[PDB]
Amino acid sequence: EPQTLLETTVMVSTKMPPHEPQVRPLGVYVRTGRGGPNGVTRVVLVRLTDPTDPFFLFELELLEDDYNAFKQHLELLVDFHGFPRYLVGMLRDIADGASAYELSFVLNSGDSNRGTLRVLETTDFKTVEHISLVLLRQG
Amino acid sequence: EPQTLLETTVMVSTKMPPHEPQVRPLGVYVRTGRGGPNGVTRVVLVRLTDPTDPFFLFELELLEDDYNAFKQHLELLVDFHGFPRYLVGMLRDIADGASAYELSFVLNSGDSNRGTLRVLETTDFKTVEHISLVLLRQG
């Protein structure tokens, strides 16, 4: 049951500081499967791509083994099964044009090995970060 | 016009890591006035106290001079006049029992010279931080 829960396009404000950002469409992909040391750990894969650029490929791979730490650090209320569903609900609503939330992706440093994907909500008073995830480049 | 905008009591989850937290009533106090190098800079003072303990006194003093940096770093939409009003609205609603938000105050390190006051909202999916402020002990 290695299932794709989301494969879609979303607008993202991207930047490598100190450069100023651009807003552009990115592919986003969320899949559950198996991995880890003996091939049996449940994983959640979150991938971000640029259709117009192959070098742009960043991934977070989250193992159930590390979830408790991850959960505590982000103050998540959902369990490992719930986590990717929650994420997908948000991302799908943003893709549909049907959400109050925005996406930002900030690279470190081209020669960037990682970026931080943020889900943001702008209230009357400020922008509020709902979640941040670190995604690593490869391939 | 050095005016007190809020003087009240609020429940706060306090902790000095690695100790576990307690929830307890704290005095909170927000005042606008003047200060800075020549006595003319507008300031916002946010004070946290413990009625049952004099050594517990922490303050943030925010000068208009530094607001732009502070604004940008927290992604605030309000200006310097608006900022303390917004903060007070939140704190007063929490004091009244009439808010979806909570307060946390995490000390560094008794021998703590500072803590971070957080305004938190628990959604169905996680706890979301709306704002954090660093307050310094003195006196």
Author numbering:
A (entry chain A), B (entry chain A): 130 to 238, 242 to 271
Authors' account:
SAS-6 organizes the rotationally ninefold symmetric cartwheel, an early assembly intermediate of centrioles that participates in establishing their symmetry and diameter. The cartwheel is organized through the homo-oligomerization of the highly conserved centriolar protein SAS-6. High-resolution crystal structures of zebrafish and C. reinhardtii SAS-6 fragments together with biochemical and biophysical characterizations demonstrated that two dimerization interfaces in SAS-6 mediate this oligomerization: a coiled-coil domain that forms a rod-like parallel dimer; and a globular N-terminal domain that forms a curved head-to-head dimer. SAS-6 is a highly conserved protein that is found in all eukaryotes that have cilia/flagella during some of their life-cycle stages.
To elucidate the structural organization of L. major SAS-6, we solved the structure of its N-terminal domain (Lm SAS-697–274) by X-ray crystallography to a resolution of 2.2 Å. The asymmetric unit (ASU) of the crystal contained three molecules that were virtually identical to each other (139 ± 2 selected pairs superpose with an rmsd of 0.70 ± 0.13 Å in secondary structure matching). Our structure demonstrates a high similarity of L. major SAS-6 to previously solved SAS-6 structures (secondary structure matching to the D. rerio SAS-6 head domain results in an rmsd of 1.59 ± 0.09 Å with 133 ± 2 selected pairs). Like these, the N-terminal domain of L. major SAS-6 consists of a 7-stranded β-barrel, capped by a helix-turn-helix motif, that forms a curved cross-handshake homo-dimer within the crystal through a highly conserved interaction interface. In this dimer, the β-hairpins formed by β-strands β6 and β7 pack antiparallelly against each other. Phenylalanine 257 at the tip of this hairpin is inserted into a conserved hydrophobic pocket that is constituted by the helix-turn-helix motif and the base of this hairpin in the B-C homo-dimer (formed by chain B and chain C in the crystal). Dimerization is also observed in solution, as judged by equilibrium ultracentrifugation, and then depends on the presence of F257. Our structural analysis also revealed the presence of an alternative arrangement of the head-to-head homo-dimer of L. major SAS-6. In the Lm SAS-697–274 crystal, the A–A homo-dimer (formed by chain A and symmetry-related chain A) shares the features of the B–C homo-dimer described above. However, in the A–A homo-dimer, the Y215 sidechain is flipped into its own hydrophobic pocket resulting in the displacement from this pocket of residue F257 of its homo-dimer partner probably weakening the interaction. We conclude that Y215 acts to partially inhibit head-to-head dimerization of L. major SAS-6.
